[PDB]
């Protein structure tokens, strides 16, 4: 147990949702998703108005492999306007550690 917070965003229990960033202004869930498609079903869309967004995966296959194929990759709305968007598996990001007090034995 690396310390938690909680009160706020019910994401909890789940393991298939990723954060969209770098979305387009006239960029929407529905054509979000149809992107997120290409690595498999897709259970849950939606979009801000922030240049950011969230898809859930019904397979955590789709979602790995998103982040590993569809990451970083120019996305196109219905619109006609592509933009290069990030995809992430949500959760804790960067990994943690410590110990408070310098290590350092004698042998090893």
Same mark, same amino acid.
């Given at each position: 147990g690396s310390s938690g917070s909680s009160g706020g !965003? !019910? *994401? &909890? &229990? *789940?393991?298939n949702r990723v954060v969209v960033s770098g979305l387009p202004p006239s960029g929407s869930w529905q054509d979000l998703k149809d992107h997120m498609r290409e690595a498999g079903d897709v259970c849950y869309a939606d979009v801000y108005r922030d240049g950011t967004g969230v898809v859930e995966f019904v397979r955590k296959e789709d979602m790995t492999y998103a982040v590993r194929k569809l990451d970083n990759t120019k996305f196109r709305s219905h619109e006609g306007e592509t933009a290069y968007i990030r995809v992430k598996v949500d959760g804790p990001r960067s990994p943690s550690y410590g110990r408070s007090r310098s290590s350092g034995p004698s042998s090893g």
């Amino acid at each position: 147990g690396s310390s938690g917070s909680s009160g706020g !965003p !019910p *994401s &909890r &229990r *789940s393991e298939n949702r990723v954060v969209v960033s770098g979305l387009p202004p006239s960029g929407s869930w529905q054509d979000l998703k149809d992107h997120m498609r290409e690595a498999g079903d897709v259970c849950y869309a939606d979009v801000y108005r922030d240049g950011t967004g969230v898809v859930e995966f019904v397979r955590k296959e789709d979602m790995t492999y998103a982040v590993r194929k569809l990451d970083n990759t120019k996305f196109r709305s219905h619109e006609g306007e592509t933009a290069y968007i990030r995809v992430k598996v949500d959760g804790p990001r960067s990994p943690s550690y410590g110990r408070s007090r310098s290590s350092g034995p004698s042998s090893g």
